[PDB]
Amino acid sequence: LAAALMQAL
Ligand SMILES: [Ag+]
Ligand SMILES: [Ag+]
């Protein structure tokens, strides 16, 4: 999940 969101950066 963290990766799925942190793709923004
Ligand atoms: Ag994974
Ligand atoms: Ag990369």
Measure the N-to-C terminal CA separation of the chain; round to a whole number of Å: 14
DSSP 4: H
Question: DSSP alpha helices (H): ranges in 1-9?
Answer: 2-6
Half-sphere exposure for 4 (CA within 13 Å, toward CB): 1
Expressed in angstroms and rounded, the spacing between residue 2 Cα and the centre of ligand 1 is 9
Resolution (A): 1.0
3 state SS of 3: helix
Expressed in angstroms and rounded, the spacing between residue 8 Cα and the centre of ligand 1 is 16
